[PDB]
Design a protein around this ligand. Sequence first.
Ligand SMILES: *[C@@H]1O[C@H](CO)[C@@H](O[C@@H]2O[C@H](CO)[C@@H](O)[C@H](O)[C@H]2NC(C)=O)[C@H](O)[C@H]1NC(C)=O
Length: 32
Amino acid sequence: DVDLGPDSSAQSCQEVDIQPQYFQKDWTKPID
Ligand SMILES: *[C@@H]1O[C@H](CO)[C@@H](O[C@@H]2O[C@H](CO)[C@@H](O)[C@H](O)[C@H]2NC(C)=O)[C@H](O)[C@H]1NC(C)=O
């Protein structure tokens, strides 16, 4: 077992905005 340093001292996790409709793009690179 190894040690991965000290734990995080943050009092709050980060805030995000999830919009999956903006990430749907038609870029196809199929395997050839
Ligand atoms: C950054 O991450 C590395 C990787 O875990 C930390 O290195 C460890 O530090 C602890 C502190 O006691 C040691 O016990 C481990 O042996 C170290 N592991 C390695 C692979 O180096 C490092 O402390 C971290 N730095 C900060 C500032 O969090």
